[PDB]
Homo-oligomer: A and B are copies of this chain.
Amino acid sequence: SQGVIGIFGDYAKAHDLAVGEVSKLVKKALSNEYPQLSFRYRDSIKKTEINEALKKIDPDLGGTLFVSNSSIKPDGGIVEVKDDYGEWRVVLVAEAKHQGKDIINIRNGLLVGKRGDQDLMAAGNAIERSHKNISEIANFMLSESHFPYVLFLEGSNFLTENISITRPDGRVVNLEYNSGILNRLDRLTAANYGMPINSNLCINKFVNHKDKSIMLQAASIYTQGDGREWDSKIMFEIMFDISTTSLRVLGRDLFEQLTSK
Chain B residues within an 8 Å CB radius of A128: 128-129, 131-132
Chain B residues within an 8 Å CB radius of A125: 129
> Which residue of chain B has its CB nearest to the CB of A140?
B190
A206: Cβ under 8 A from any B Cβ:
yes
Given A128-B131, A129-B129, A64 and B195 contact (CB-CB distance below 8 Å): yes
User: Do residues A135 and B207 form an inter-chain contact, with CB atoms below 8 A?
Assistant: no
Interface residues of A in 127-185 (CB under 8 A from B): 128-129, 131-132, 134-136, 139, 142-143, 145, 160, 177-180, 183, 185
Chain B residues within an 8 Å CB radius of A178: 66-68
Given A129-B128, A180-B70, A194 and B63 contact (CB-CB distance below 8 Å): yes
Interface residues of A in 208-252 (CB under 8 A from B): 208-209, 212-215
A202: Cβ under 8 A from any B Cβ:
no
Given A51-B194, A194-B51, A214-B214, A207 and B57 contact (CB-CB distance below 8 Å): yes
A205: Cβ under 8 A from any B Cβ:
yes
Chain B residues within an 8 Å CB radius of A50: 194
Given A66-B183, A183-B67, A132 and B58 contact (CB-CB distance below 8 Å): no
Given A67-B178, A125-B129, A61 and B186 contact (CB-CB distance below 8 Å): no
Interface size, A (range): 35 or more
For this chain, the copies found in one complex come to 2
User: Do residues A190 and B135 form an inter-chain contact, with CB atoms below 8 A?
Assistant: yes
A234 vs B68: C-alpha distance in the bound complex, in angstroms?
A: 30
A186 vs B50: C-alpha distance in the bound complex, in angstroms?
A: 12
What is the 8 Å Cβ interface bit string for chain A, positions 48-62, against chain B (1 contact, 0 not)? 001100100110111
A51 vs B195: C-alpha distance in the bound complex, in angstroms?
A: 10
A18: Cβ under 8 A from any B Cβ:
no
Chain B CB count within 10 A is highest, among A58, A189, A212, for A189
Q: Which of B62, B66, B129, B213 contacts A213 (CB 8 A)?
A: B213
A260: Cβ under 8 A from any B Cβ:
no
User: Do residues A58 and B207 form an inter-chain contact, with CB atoms below 8 A?
Assistant: yes
A63 vs B201: C-alpha distance in the bound complex, in angstroms?
A: 14
A69: Cβ under 8 A from any B Cβ:
yes
17 A-B pairs with CB atoms under 8 Å apart are A47-B189, A60-B195, A60-B205, A61-B193, A64-B186, A64-B197, A66-B183, A66-B185, A69-B180, A128-B128, A129-B129, A131-B135, A132-B187, A142-B207, A206-B212, A213-B214, A214-B214
The 8 closest A-B CB pairs, nearest first, are A131-B131, A135-B190, A62-B194, A128-B132, A128-B129, A67-B180, A66-B185, A64-B194
